[PDB]
Design a protein around this nucleic acid. Structure first.
Lengths: 66, 95, 155
RNA sequence: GACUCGUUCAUACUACAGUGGAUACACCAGAUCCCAUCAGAACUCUGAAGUUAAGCACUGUAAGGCUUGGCUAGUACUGAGGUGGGAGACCGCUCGGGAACACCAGGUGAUGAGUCAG
RNA sequence: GGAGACAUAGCCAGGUGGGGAGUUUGACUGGGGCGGUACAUCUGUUAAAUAUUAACGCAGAUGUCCAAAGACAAGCUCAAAGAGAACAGAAAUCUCUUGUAGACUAAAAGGGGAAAAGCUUGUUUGAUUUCUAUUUUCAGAACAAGUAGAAAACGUGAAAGCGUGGCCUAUCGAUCCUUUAUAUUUGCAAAAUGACGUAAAUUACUUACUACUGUGCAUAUAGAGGUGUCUGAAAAGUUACCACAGGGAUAACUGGCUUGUGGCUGCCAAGCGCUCCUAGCGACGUAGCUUUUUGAUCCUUCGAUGUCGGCUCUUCCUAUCAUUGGGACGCAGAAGUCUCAAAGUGUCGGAUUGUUCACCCGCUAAUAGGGAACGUGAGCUGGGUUUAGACCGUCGUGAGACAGGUUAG
RNA sequence: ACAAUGUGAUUUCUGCCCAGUGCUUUGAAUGUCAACUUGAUGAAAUUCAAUCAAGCGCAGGUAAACGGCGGGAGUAACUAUG
RNA sequence: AUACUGACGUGCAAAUCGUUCAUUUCAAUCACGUUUAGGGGCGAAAGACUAAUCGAAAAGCCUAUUAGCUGGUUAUUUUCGAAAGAUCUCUCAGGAUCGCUGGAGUUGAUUAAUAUAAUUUUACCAGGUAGAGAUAAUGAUUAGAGGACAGGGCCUUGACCUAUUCUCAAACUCCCAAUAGGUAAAAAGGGCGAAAUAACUCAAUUUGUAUUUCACUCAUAUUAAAUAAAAUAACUCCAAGUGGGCCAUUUUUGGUAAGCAGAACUGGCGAUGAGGGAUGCUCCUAACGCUUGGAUAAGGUGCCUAAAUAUUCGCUCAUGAGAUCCCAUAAAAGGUGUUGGUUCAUAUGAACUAGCCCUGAAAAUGGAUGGCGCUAAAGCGGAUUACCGAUACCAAGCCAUAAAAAGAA
RNA sequence: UCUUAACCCACUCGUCUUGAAACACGGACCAAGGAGUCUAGCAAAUGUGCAAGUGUAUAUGAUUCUUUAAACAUUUUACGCAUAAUUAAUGUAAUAUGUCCAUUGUAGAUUUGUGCCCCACUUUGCAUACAAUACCGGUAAGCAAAUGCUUUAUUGAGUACGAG
RNA sequence: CGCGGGGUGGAGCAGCCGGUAGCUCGUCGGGCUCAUAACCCGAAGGUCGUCGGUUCAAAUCCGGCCCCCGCAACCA
């Protein structure tokens, strides 16, 4: 029964009451969707680097104890 | 809309590769008495109380999605392929 | 009323005059890195990978590159909040951004200046300072060669 | 002097003229084979007898176009302000920003990589 | 006596069944309703140069079609115009020249498209299976449509490459249910249904070792069968016999804004007025005023402002019909006609009506026009629209309905 | 005679239509059409067939049953109408 | 129980009374007893009646039925304080969920900063609305001119070609604003180097890619452009109220228009006192503890009514003058009223022009520049000051709230 | 203190409604009574007691007997919820075992030192955020002589020194 | 003035279901008969309301105008 249709009125003013919130801008981002093959090689590289670090850490610690 | 009777296309299962299939039209089966919902519906319907479920009198479409039965030449398997809602459908007899 | 994909694009996705047809190969050869900023600017010839209306002329970081696709993180205002949205665009629609290129040039000149300043052992101020300060100044025009002006009368 | 791969994508276009052919390009000669058609026209293959007549390059033209610049014009238009004006329609003023067509003058390209005869 | 294994009675079952029961009969909505869909959607425009954005805004389109009009490659260039050629002419086919698309792109409209995205031809079926990140709508859920990739198997091309439908923007549908696909995955509740399979053993309830084990039902995963009131009730009429809950969120009554329509006043100067623009006129045109018209409207009032008209009674207005004073005249007088100051004064009897209005007949001196809550219902009247009874016509299968007519209230 | 209706003294009459919607009449020749029953099948559940039911359908009857009861052109020695 | 629509209509009476009128030997009237009972009876049919009860009696109960709807919904101070948009909805008087709000917590913060920002700067883009155009395309569209198939009667008219020419478009576009929009301005980082890792990568284990470890070093000891009561920032939790709004400027669509319907941006009101606008929810000024004083704003200063019958220059007399935005009427058109201008002619004659004033200019209780009044203004147009003028503004006191100092003899 | 005055100001309150001084609705007046409660289950908050447990259930017991209808006690695998997830489901199910050490990053509270104390380096590095790997149940795909397997995908309210 | 149906020969219907427009009466030519009809034989005639659009092809299908008939004006 005979309604009014629309208005954008006050909505912008309401938005400015708490301001328009913006990105948190993280340095790391979850990478599920990113380039297969290249990213699984990156996973192998990363695992490789971790293994390299582990080998270095274990040998150095064992050397220090002796 | 017109499809031929045969198609070389991928078989996924029991044959693992592109091979011939014969192409046919799904006929939409027919209900059997021993279905669980029908068992439930018959029992509820039975006795005093008349009809116990809705009756879908309302209709808007005269058309049907067409779905092909693909029957593998190499192996014993069937595979479905469904395609756009049609009022007009043909098997073979090309232009 | 209706709200399909290209809704309201008659003027916007028109070609510019004298720019009709396919564009040069050497546009496509242009090299892109992850973490580049990149503008999304669309020639209307190639129809696949065409971004939505809002992203035309927008700029954002490349976060992902594919075979002929580029993922670009673009900000969109959704009512009371701006959020980053993953716009996939084509080699055709990417333009290397220029704000970064001013920073790069600025850095290069500053680095040479820093090398010189350190070499001379005297401080400098990098700052792109104010506009408005004017020194005192001289007019050497002959005293009857100056232009004498008055208001303009009517028709 | 010449060519190939290019780049910008008309200063590179279009139109009518004139000027040029060491090497080169091209026009040109042939059809067995590969090939291709109705057609050796094209395309494919094989030639090298002739030629600037064309293609092509360069230049010219009260050329047309494009292209820069002036001039159109601080005109038209326009943001903000005003218990400003005007019966209203509208029009000033204050703070600001500011075109387009026509017209007139200039211009008619530049360039990366490689090669051959200087 | 008569009838008789038929009746009848009981219990099943089909049919008939408004006699009776219980119930349904959307919404938006320039009020209600006939109508339409603005109810799912797609284009341009409205929309005010990112985007956003409404109306029963505008111009529209939609519920498909396509084994090619799909896929890849290759070749080609279209519409048109000029100049030519038997039949052959304005159009038929063929040729040469000119041809930035003026063609065509399944269908709308708008974008894009010339060594193509058009046309011709060749080879084909990727219009394939599996999966993300996403983009659109937007909750940034669903569904639907997309984009960019990935894992497969291939198709095509000389290769680079390209192909996960249609050049792009449209062409569509939950839960439950049914149905067919799919599986070295499962279940049907203390157990079993290949097969006593393969070994040994042989007094027998022997002893090991075995991925593949009845019908039927249930799953799990994947489609399809549909809901257009399209984020999904199985739902026709009717009430002037009616009731209830609300409603000035909404008509009929005043008022109000406006003044299209009506009415009144202008300006002008082509004609008319013998002759003569304007004595009187005045078109084609063009400006105002008003709300005694009818509208448009829905601000005000629905826990009520008594719904028409007449009668009666008073007052105000002037845009003066007559009476008083004048001006002009197409004016001889008599008249008469246009006009101004003027609202002091007057403006009637009937016939016919439900009547404002209208229309006759007659007087008059003339029988002007309006306001006052559409003047005036605790002033009247109750004839009329309009309660409940009734009638006729038409319409409705019907019950009933009718700014159709009538009588009684 | 009982039950059920319509019309409404007298007088004068009561035209057309059984198509529609009703009601009504005949029936294995006959289309459809139920339970039970009967047979076939399978290891059984089951799955299939088969069966002069009525009804409807086909075929009649009926309007003092419900009801209903057209449109155009042309045409006469004046003119007009037809 | 027909009529007087009589009396009566807080009655003699919740239907009486008066007068009139119908009935009176039969389908008559009267009594008593009797029958038929609630979706039932009974009905000479009016849905009539069935104990002041009826389109379903009375009594009691399921029942405190149900109600998206109406009404009402109770001491005080202090603090923060909205929405009337949105999505889906048999949804449009409703609900849910978003938005905005509050509480509570934690994180950040205390280092004049960095994070950060309804802001600009300098870079850097993206545009096709206003504008402008028809000699750029599309759709229009008025004229002639110059040329080599058709009409009229060798000649002429056309069309048609070619260059022009007039006026043009929300849904046309060569070109094209302002406004609005986006990215940018360095330390969890960036430079240039080395070494590592790969099943990614190329012919090629440094051939790259990316990552990791070590290096060397970039402004910030005024901050790689400003400015910032920039942490009053974040973030999590839990919840409310709300979903009918309205008004103004400017842009604006429909509609004859509308205090009309519908949008856009922003500001108000709503939810708001106070001073002005004569009065007035919205206009203007301006947002408010309690007080004292000041000086101002909007606005005034003839009197009502506080301050000037101030100063100063013009213009203005009206037998219905005129007098502060919204705001309560007013135009085309005239004027030998007066005032300035400007073009012409010969201190005169013309012609124009805009200022005031006049005509154009009629309505309804008695009547409204607010009223009285005002004309050497208290009118209209300026200017010059002074004075008056708010809870706004400054200083001071006191109160509470918020934060900060500082403190466990 | 009460009382009139006088100057200036002063519209019926409640109410629904965008909007009431209203020609909107309710209210003649005064007194008393007169409307967000209670139960169930759930959630977050904050307090409190305990913690890989917790509650003591029904009930038993006692030198417990106006108030006692509460209070007190409970001769070592009861039950609820939490200590494990996954899943139609037979089921399966958490660093991987060379190590009583005890997953990888980047910020990040806290600590050593140097050049009272803020400091400026270094130094060590929780919560938490952002990521990352592992690994378990489901599902794919590849394999499959069943102690079912396999790098790779995917998926769960997962898990990576328990919080209830 | 708001809804929906229809325009084809002189007249009235077919085609009007996309290409090739049929039938009757009327009109026209010839017979038959004192004479005239009736009767018999044979033909001619459609421009498909009008302006524009689709499609290989439109009288037909697609719109807008022009006429023609049918509905509609109710609660106010």
């Amino acid at each position: 029964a005979k309604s009014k249709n629309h208005t954008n009125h006050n909505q912008n003013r309401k938005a400015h009451k708490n301001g328009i919130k913006k990105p948190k801008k993280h340095k790391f981002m979850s990478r599920k969707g990113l380039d297969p093959n290249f990213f699984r090689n990156q996973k192998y590289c990363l695992k490789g680097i971790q293994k390299k670090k582990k080998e270095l850490k274990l040998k150095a610690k064992q050397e220090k104890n002796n | 809309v017109n499809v031929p009777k045969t198609r070389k296309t991928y078989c996924s299962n029991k044959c693992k590769k592109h091979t011939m299939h014969k192409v046919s039209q799904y006929k939409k089966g027919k209900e059997r008495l021993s279905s669980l919902g029908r068992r439930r519906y018959d029992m509820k319907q039975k006795g005093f109380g008349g009809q116990t479920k809705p009756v879908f009198k309302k209709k808007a479409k005269t058309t049907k999605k067409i779905v092909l039965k693909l029957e593998c030449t190499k192996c014993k398997k069937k595979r479905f392929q469904t395609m756009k809602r049609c009022k007009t459908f043909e098997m073979g007899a090309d232009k | 009323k209706s709200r399909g994909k290209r809704s309201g694009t008659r003027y916007k996705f028109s070609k510019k005059f004298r720019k009709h047809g396919e564009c040069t190969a050497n546009k496509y050869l242009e090299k892109l890195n992850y973490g580049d900023y990149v503008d999304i600017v669309c020639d209307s010839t190639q129809q696949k990978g065409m971004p939505f209306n809002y992203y035309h002329g927008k700029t954002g970081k490349i976060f992902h590159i594919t075979k002929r696709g580029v993922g670009v993180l673009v900000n969109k205002r959704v009512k009371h909040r701006i959020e980053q949205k993953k716009v996939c665009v084509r080699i055709e629609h990417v333009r290397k951004s220029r704000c970064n290129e001013d920073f790069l040039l600025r850095k290069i000149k500053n680095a040479e200046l820093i090398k010189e300043a350190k070499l001379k052992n005297e401080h400098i101020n990098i700052k792109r300072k104010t506009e408005g300060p004017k020194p005192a100044a001289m007019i050497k025009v002959p005293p009857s060669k100056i232009i004498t002006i008055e208001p303009l009368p009517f028709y």
